[PDB]
Symmetry: C3
Subunit: 340 residues, 3 copies
């Protein structure tokens, strides 16, 4: 299974973690994730160095994670800080691997690769998630597809015209303007849908207003698989900076080669103290991101065996440029790492 | 997967198909099966050319199946007839594979193999199924075993096995016979229980009873549809039914003759063939072969011809 | 994948068997186990020689197991004794493999290997199990781990401190003392846990206590759990002799036969309760959880070339492990 290990991935949302460890597998690597008594999150390889028991089934003793099996204790650095057996000696072999963790932007980032290379400067900017001018809601979902399929999905936001048609269909779709801007290690796909009546969901954003709007659906990608979109609507022929908008957290982390973690969110500048608009956004997230898109990408994954065995290649359309560029960047990184 | 792909297989019963596509895999090939607005059945490879989404999760748009993902639209021939995107150009690369498909004898036949070789004249004769001299009912079942195990079971049970070109017939007459319970009341007798196999796995039996020494064609009888189609190497689809010339207007009789367990496979035999399939690993690893009994003649013949069709297909 | 096939394994408890066959796989070999009308247990390959049906889904007819599919009948030797078809001929090709079986000590022992080599003399001694001075109770558990992970567990019984916290905790356990004796194909870990107050379990039946365990190849263990007022001779204790016997099912799953044979309270049904309760919670639940968890981590450990780091409690389990691997590779030496 080929992953890009030397990169930061979101392993969890902060709300997911506590002093009770969470066992989760990223890049085929099982982790025990917990918040220590002092509040700082730790991430240990979920395999006790003694007999390979899951430490994530342990409990904290003295703020140290204790193996459930024979009770070796570890700090957040993976250092064995107590051995209860015999003379109680703790040689270097008893230490477990620890992973660099940065909690930032209401995300838990982890470096699954060479820890000497982990550079917090390199973590993607998701500042809107902690910016008090934005209201942020979201969650986690597990999907039985290769993460790359969900990168494809998200880098062609036009799929929403069909996959999400009940919420997202617009009658101005055939007037789409699409631009792609390639950075170094960053790619923006911009869409302007001009002059239409708002979609069901943009209508909700606007509290019903039925009259013609402009809508923008931009998405930004940073390596390996972390995306931030810009979903905006505004009376036709108004500035884009002045629009009500959602900045959408859409971050994938591989679990196995054929399964992945999906961390999604909306950070919105409108209806900031409105629980019902919270519910609208979490509704959308539940139906669109976690069912509708799940159904499509999970079915594509099930067809991978046929595609491969019959040497089938995709046929590309005008909507594909951003997703293909991103795909070729991920491949390029994969291949760099594969030596060695 | 070793299949005989160059043959007609039943993919569906016509009553399973509508303008809402059915997704079904035959011989490790996923199909989208639907009826166009003029009623004609289309069979497409269930994998969109763009990014491989399941067309069978799509709906029709003006008679054309629309991909649920980014909206490419296809005709029954697999031609892409609409591309919503950009200049809306439809190069040959956007066409999806379409499979030869014939609706005939109230069955949907598909040719999953080399399409140049697909000859609808070679489709097995199940004509009793649309003969109004017969009352026809049946249904569909799925089994987690290799299809050859159910062909075996089916070709089993004055005798007579007669053998030819992709057809084998197994005949049994039982004179001074015993009447079946269903045909009981519609009259000693002669019984008949015959079965005809055509390649690769399509069978039609003949369960019959008459007064002593009657034309077997004039008997009280049922012709039973028993057609298997491989799904994976270790699973199959089973299409079953009966075409009867008695109680043609009794619907209670329809009910039992529509029973999977009454007509196709009792829970207890299903348990056995699926259990045989779980034993396949062990037998293969230990080079264990089956030991045949006298009653195995027809099965073995049919087995040998299938194997012959397999061997021919390589290369 | 790699098993020691030339050895005796427990395939069932006697009370699991009857005229209704049981299908059970040992060392990747599916068996049909049943008790004939004369009381004698037979073990056949659970694959009809005709078309491979599960004979274990069949019934006895005149004491002969009848294939459910087309009704061949077999004796306990695997001879075909009836063919209801055509002229009823029974060619030798219709016989099924029958495995050597010995019912001893309230266990059913099967030899899955080279049948020429099956010496019932080499079956381990669990005589306490049919001793009138002992009351024996236990049962069967299935586990989704490689059996060797459960040998490990049983040979280092100083996890009960943490895995079994609730029943088997003692403050004495920093004052353990653990002696290991190795004989030919037999290893004993001894231990006397002196001076300490009793765990929940030992109170339920200033105390001294002792967990010894005997391993015999391949994976058959008998333990000794005793307890007695501080000062008392080990040999005059009240104690349980614990049957802990594993049989591989597949490379990543096994069969566990556990029991207690106790010399105390032996008419006493409450005591049956306590002992069956421990077995349910400790053995078939808590230990289950840990070893199945470790099995799931095998892929990563092997892919990454991780070897375990051993501790002071680990001698017995390590010596046993090394002997199993020895036998395993010896046999792969074709
Ligand atoms: C998938 O991206 C979105 C679209 Cl296309 C419309 C509205 C929203 Cl809230 C999102 C989102 O960020 O989840
Ligand atoms: C696992 O072995 C035991 C220990 Cl460590 C304590 C008490 C008992 Cl009853 C047993 C037993 O034989 O199950
Ligand atoms: S497995 Fe962790 S202490 Fe033994
Ligand atoms: S996958 Fe069918 S149109 Fe994109
Ligand atoms: S499979 Fe046992 S008699 Fe046919
Ligand atoms: Fe979507
Ligand atoms: Fe235990």
């Amino acid at each position: 299974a080929t992953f890009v290990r030397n990169a930061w991935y979101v392993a969890a949302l902060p709300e997911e973690l506590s002093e009770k460890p969470l066992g989760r597998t990223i890049l085929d690597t099982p982790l025990a994730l917990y918040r220590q008594p002092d509040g700082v999150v730790a991430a240990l390889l979920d395999i006790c160095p003694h007999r390979f028991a899951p430490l994530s089934d342990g409990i904290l003793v003295n703020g140290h994670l204790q193996c459930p099996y024979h009770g070796l204790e570890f700090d957040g650095g993976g250092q064995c800080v107590h051995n209860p057996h015999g003379n109680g000696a703790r040689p270097a072999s008893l230490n477990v691997r620890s992973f660099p963790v940065v909690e930032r932007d209401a995300l838990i980032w982890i470096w699954p690769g060479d820890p000497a290379l982990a550079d917090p400067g390199a973590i993607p900017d998701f500042g809107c998630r902690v910016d008090p001018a934005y209201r942020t809601v979201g969650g986690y979902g597990h999907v039985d597809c290769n993460y790359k399929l969900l990168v494809d999905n998200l880098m062609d936001l036009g799929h929403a015209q069909y996959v999400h048609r009940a919420n997202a269909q617009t009658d101005a779709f055939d007037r789409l303007e699409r631009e792609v801007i390639v950075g170094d290690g960053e790619i923006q796909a911009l869409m302007k849908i001009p002059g239409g009546t708002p979609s069901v969901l943009m209508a909700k954003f606007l509290r019903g207003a039925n009259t013609p709007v402009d809508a923008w659906n931009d998405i930004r990608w940073n390596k390996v698989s972390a995306m931030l979109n810009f979903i905006a609507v505004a009376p036709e022929g108004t500035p884009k900076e002045q629009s009500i908008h959602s900045r959408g957290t859409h971050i994938l982390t591989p679990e196995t080669e054929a399964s992945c973690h999906y961390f999604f969110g909306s950070s919105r500048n409108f209806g900031i103290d409105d629980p019902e608009m919270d519910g609208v956004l979490r509704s959308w997230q539940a139906q669109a991101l976690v069912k509708e898109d799940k159904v499509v990408v999970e079915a594509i994954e099930r067809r991978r065996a046929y595609v491969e065995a019959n040497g089938i290649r995709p046929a590309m359309l005008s909507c594909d440029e951003a997703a293909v560029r991103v795909s070729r960047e991920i491949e390029k990184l994969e291949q760099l790492e594969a030596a060695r």
